[PDB]
Each structure stands twice: as structure tokens, then as C-alpha cells.
């Protein structure tokens, strides 16, 4: 095993900042065969920078590389919202090749509530079988967030499925989703179903809900 | 330049053999070297094997876990890389990158987009899909959230567009997850203001064990 390590783990940016995400060696390689990929989610290695300091067809030119010896180093000028990936260095020096933890980056915004939401089961679903209460909760900033579905008061989380969202592109804003998910015997068994939020921006909660509009 | 496309992904009760395969385009570039990258959640990426050509026929060299395993081979005549890989586990499933390299003084090298390999124990299982219109009233602002849940499908390879592709402004997939070797995940559009003749908004999907649902709004 050969070890490359990267320093940081996850980064926070303002748009128009300098970022500069390290690599560094085990052993004493080359400058040149410290290769840098950049993956953006939901996507494949998007080969960035090649030797330790030339740019690959496209990368912008904002973008900076340099090092010799065990650190090696990559610079953005300007930090701008599309560079908002997760970076990786790479050895091709001896076998094994192998690569950075990978940073993180993120692009910085203002905090913003968000747009929750909460349809009801789905006509097809429910005469199928089991039926879920799902719970959209849109656009929202930062990602440090919690959320309960309380229905008639004791929060009942039992099938509560948290699924998040990577930033945006155009807006640059975490969305998640979560689903309650019940045995129909224990659907009609309720009434007030209510999803509530809670998150750093309103200390007084969201809490869009459904009494009953089907039945 | 360049054009790699890989075949072959799925899915294998563990121990399953397979055949990944990549074809170079672009290339009869006298001298590369090729090989395949793979990564899951587990271990982000790792180089898992290379053939190599400076001139030489064959030269392999593969890795701590991989070796015994799987043999990389291709052959120039063919245009093609194939990867077959044995005995494999769980340890084993990702997406293989077929990403080869030119040995110029300098350049870079490519790389294509990959496949899923899924080593589970388990069997496939179509998606139920269902819509997701409103309730009684969307309210917040003047806008509205549609919605579509996809409870119960099994290998993960999974595409869900809204209205043959053709409106994208405000969509959001949500990464699917697991309860019970069986994954669920659901989208949202939030189309304008005016709660519209609902009638054209479809929301299609695709799930390569065989399926392609549709839909439609209350």
C-alpha cells in the first residue's frame, strides 16, 4: 500500500473566494504523475488536472496546481458555484495506483427556509396495500436539519425514510424527502397528519398537514 | 479525442461470473495502457486492473484484492477491453471506469462513464411507481409540488424523467435507498403558479430489469 491523504475533508466557500485543497504522498514520488479529477454528483471522474500543474481540455483557468517532493496542492482563484464537486488526487507512479480520500467542496449561501410539502397516500397504492404519507421539504439552506411526523401529537416514527438531495446548480439548495410508511390498518386508525420541520431559520417550526380531503 | 463506451453491467447471485467490456474510439494509438478504476460508497475509487501495450503483447498487473480474480484482456484487432471477473462478493460491486491512457510524452488520459455491478444474494423486482398530486391545497406562494414514489425495485440501476424529458426546471430526484433489499426513492416538480390542466404533466420512468411505467395528476 502506497497512501496519498487530503486535507480537508469537506470545505465551505463564498462565491468569489480562494480555495486550496492538498495532497500528499507516503513515500517521496514525482511531481509529475500526480494526476487531479474532479466528480460532480451524479456523474463519472472528470480527469482535471494532469502532471502536477497542466489543466485538462476545459478546465477553467481560474483553477491553480503546484507542488514537488510529498505536497502537492490545488488552488482555485476565484471560487465560483460550479466548482462545487468533490476532487480527488491520483498516483500512476508505481503500482498500486491509488488515490486521495477526495475533498469536498461546497459553495456558500444565505440561509433560506424551505418549501415543505405533504401529499397524501396515492389512489393506486392503497387499494394495492400498504399506504405512505410522503413529505417533500424543498430548497432549503444549510443541510444541518432535523424533521419528525407527528400524527395526533406522539410523533410516530416508525418507517420514516430520510432521503437527501447534493446542492443545486441553479439555486444551490439542499431538498429532501422523507416517507412514513403504514399498514393501511393503522391509516384509517388516524387523523391529523402532520409533518413539522425544524430548521435554523423560524424558531417557530413548519408544519404543512392533512386532516382528510379523499374521504 | 476520444469515445469509450462500456457494456455489460448487472447484476449476479454472488460467486457470479462476468464480462464488462469497453470499445476504444478514436484511438489505434500506437502505444496506450488501459484499465479499469471502480467505485462504491464503501471505498470510494480504486485501480483495480491494467493491461498494458507500449509494444509489448501483454503485460498485466492487478492489485491486494483483485488478483486470482478477474484477468483484464483486449485486443487491438477487436477494438475492444473486455474484464471478466470470478468468485465475486460483496466487497466487489460498484462501477467499473474504463479509463485509458496514452503513453505521448504528455497528454491525459480519458475515461468513459461505467455500468453497475450489484453482487447480492437477492432477486430482481419491478418498481410501483404511483403519482403524487397534491391533497387539497398546495399553498406556498403562488406555485405548486407534484410528486412520484417508487417503492420496490431491486437492482439499483433506476431513471425517472418528468414528461418525456422535456421539463427539467425545478425537478429534483432524491438518492434511493434501502429497507429490506428493496429500494425506494421519489422525485418533484414544481411547475407554475396556476395548478395547470394537470393533463399534460407524465411522470415516465425506466428500470432496466425489464419495466417503463408512466403517469398522471388528480
Known amino acids: 500500500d502506497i497512501q496519498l491523504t487530503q486535507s480537508p475533508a469537506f470545505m465551505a466557500a463564498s462565491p468569489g473566494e480562494k480555495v486550496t485543497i492538498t495532497c500528499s504522498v507516503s513515500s517521496s514520488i514525482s511531481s509529475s504523475n500526480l494526476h487531479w479529477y474532479q466528480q460532480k454528483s451524479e456523474t463519472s471522474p472528470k480527469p482535471w488536472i494532469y502532471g502536477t500543474s497542466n489543466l485538462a481540455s476545459g478546465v477553467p483557468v481560474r483553477f491553480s496546481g503546484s507542488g514537488s517532493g510529498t505536497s502537492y496542492s490545488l488552488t482555485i482563484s476565484s471560487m465560483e458555484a460550479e466548482d462545487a464537486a468533490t476532487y480527488y488526487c491520483?498516483?500512476?507512479?508505481?503500482?498500486?495506483?491509488?488515490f486521495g480520500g477526495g475533498t469536498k467542496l461546497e459553495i456558500k449561501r444565505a440561509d433560506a427556509a424551505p418549501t415543505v410539502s405533504i401529499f397524501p397516500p396515492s389512489s393506486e397504492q392503497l387499494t394495492s396495500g400498504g399506504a405512505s404519507v410522503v413529505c417533500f421539504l424543498n430548497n432549503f439552506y444549510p443541510k444541518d436539519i432535523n424533521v419528525k411526523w407527528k400524527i395526533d401529537g406522539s410523533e410516530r416514527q416508525n418507517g420514516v425514510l430520510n432521503s437527501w438531495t447534493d446542492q443545486d446548480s441553479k439555486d444551490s439548495t439542499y431538498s429532501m424527502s422523507s416517507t412514513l410508511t403504514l399498514t393501511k390498518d393503522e391509516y384509517e386508525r388516524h387523523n391529523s397528519y402532520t409533518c413539522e420541520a425544524t430548521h435554523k431559520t423560524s424558531t417557530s417550526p413548519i408544519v404543512k398537514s392533512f386532516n382528510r380531503n379523499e374521504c | 479525442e476520444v469515445k469509450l463506451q462500456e457494456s455489460g453491467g448487472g447484476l449476479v447471485q454472488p460467486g457470479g461470473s462476468m464480462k464488462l467490456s469497453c470499445v476504444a474510439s478514436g484511438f489505434t494509438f500506437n502505444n496506450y495502457w488501459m484499465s479499469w478504476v471502480r467505485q462504491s460508497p464503501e471505498k470510494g475509487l480504486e485501480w483495480v486492473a491494467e493491461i498494458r501495450l507500449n509494444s509489448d503483447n501483454f503485460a498485466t498487473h492487478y492489485a491486494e484484492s483483485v488478483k486470482g480474480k478477474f484477468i483484464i484482456s483486449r485486443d487491438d484487432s477487436k477494438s475492444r477491453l473486455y474484464l471478466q471477473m470470478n468468485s465475486l462478493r460483496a466487497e466487489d460491486t460498484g462501477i467499473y471506469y474504463c479509463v485509458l491512457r496514452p503513453l505521448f510524452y504528455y497528454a491525459v488520459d480519458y475515461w468513459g462513464q461505467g455500468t453497475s455491478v450489484t453482487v447480492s444474494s437477492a432477486k430482481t423486482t419491478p418498481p410501483s411507481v404511483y403519482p403524487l398530486a397534491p391533497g387539497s391545497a398546495a399553498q406556498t406562494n403562488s406555485m405548486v409540488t407534484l410528486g412520484c414514489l417508487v417503492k420496490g425495485y431491486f437492482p439499483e440501476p433506476v431513471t425517472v424523467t418528468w414528461n418525456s424529458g422535456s421539463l427539467s426546471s425545478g425537478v429534483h430526484t432524491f438518492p434511493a435507498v434501502l429497507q429490506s433489499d428493496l429500494y425506494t426513492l421519489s422525485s418533484s416538480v414544481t411547475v407554475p403558479s396556476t395548478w395547470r390542466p394537470s393533463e399534460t404533466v407524465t411522470c415516465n420512468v425506466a428500470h432496466p430489469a425489464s419495466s417503463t411505467k408512466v403517469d398522471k395528476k388528480i
Open positions: 491520483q498516483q500512476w507512479n508505481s503500482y498500486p495506483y491509488t
